[PDB]
């Protein structure tokens, strides 16, 4: 639960949201090709892999038009980020099952 707490801290600080508002989660499985930008989905890497997803929501999150999310493939962390007001995905972390493609986890309190 460390990563979800780091993401909540980051998002509530970035968007000046109430720190004590409860976040709820929607989880669905879906292939990476339908949920990640085309440039990050390649044959032999993320293409055709089913991801387990966590999308967080609340009243103020809905007011801000943002969807924070965490993606996994089996036990491997695949992505940390949020969908923004323009429905663009902004990644704090992205891994294609082979290697990290994007890593701004230094913005998180984890030290990674």
């Amino acid at each position: 639960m460390t990563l979800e707490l780091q993401l909540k801290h980051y998002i509530t600080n970035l968007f000046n949201l109430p720190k004590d508002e409860k976040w709820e989660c929607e989880s669905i499985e879906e292939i990476a090709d339908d949920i990640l930008p085309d440039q990050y989905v390649r044959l032999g890497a993320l293409s055709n892999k089913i991801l387990q997803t966590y999308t967080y929501y609340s009243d103020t999150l809905h007011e801000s038009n943002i969807y924070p999310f965490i993606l996994y493939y089996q036990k491997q962390l695949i992505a940390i980020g949020y969908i923004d007001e323009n429905h663009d995905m902004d990644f704090l972390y992205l891994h294609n099952t082979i290697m990290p493609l994007l890593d701004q986890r230094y913005l998180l309190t984890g030290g990674q």
Partner: protein
């Protein structure tokens, strides 16, 4: 005790061995409930079956597993009154509002009126451990809900099936698409909303599934669904 209403027991006509297999899945969940929090409660995991007679089902909407934070109410996608509307349900509302001029997105996630009109909101997995999506994916619910889908296809004269995303789409081969209207698209999740001008599958927003469903029902002489909430 198979937790199902008597009308559903009559509808499914479960063989003795299938009755025992369902009872075994129920027993597994009962064992797991003493070790951890499981959603929904036992007397709510069949709520999806209690809103209409199975012979009156006109639309089947498939979900995956229940919400795992206490908001599940035994229906796919729906949440109980007072709970914030989850993202996929918001996008469902958005497609309803685009396609149906009389539909206005509500401030709640309660789909009871749909269920009462013969919309079956069926999660393929009927329980989940708190905070752990997919944790009950392999305890036997999938066999049961697969069989339910097959029997709905076989026993109903005319029905609409809405399969959103890859997981639900995998169930299409269970359905007789000559008897029934099988509507497919990408998942309503905001994660799948904006993507690639590549997807062989049509986007959820714009899929027109609720209009096509009511057109089908009208063509077959059945009462249309009032989708308003």
């Amino acid at each position: 005790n198979l937790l199902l209403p008597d009308l559903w027991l009559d509808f499914l006509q479960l063989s003795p061995i299938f009755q025992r297999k369902l009872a075994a899945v129920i027993a597994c969940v009962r064992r797991l409930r003493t070790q951890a929090t499981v959603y929904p409660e036992e007397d709510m995991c069949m709520a999806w079956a209690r809103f209409c007679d199975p012979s009156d089902i006109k639309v089947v909407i498939l979900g995956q597993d229940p919400y795992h934070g206490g908001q599940a109410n035994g229906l796919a996608f729906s949440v109980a009154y007072g709970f914030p509307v989850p993202p996929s349900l918001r996008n469902i509302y958005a497609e309803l509002h685009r396609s149906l001029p009389e539909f206005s997105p509500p401030d709640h996630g309660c789909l009871d009126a749909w269920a009462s009109q013969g919309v079956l909101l069926l999660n393929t997995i009927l329980t989940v451990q708190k905070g752990k999506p997919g944790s009950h994916a392999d305890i036997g619910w999938a066999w049961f809900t697969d069989h339910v889908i097959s029997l709905l296809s076989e026993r109903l004269k005319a029905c609409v099936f809405m399969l959103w995303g890859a997981k639900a789409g995998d169930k299409a081969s269970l359905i007789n698409s000559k008897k029934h209207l099988v509507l497919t698209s990408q998942h309503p999740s905001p994660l799948a909303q904006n993507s690639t001008r590549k997807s062989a599958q049509q986007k959820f927003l714009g899929n027109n599934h609720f209009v096509l469903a009511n057109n089908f029902l009208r063509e077959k002489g059945l009462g249309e669904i009032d989708w308003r909430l």
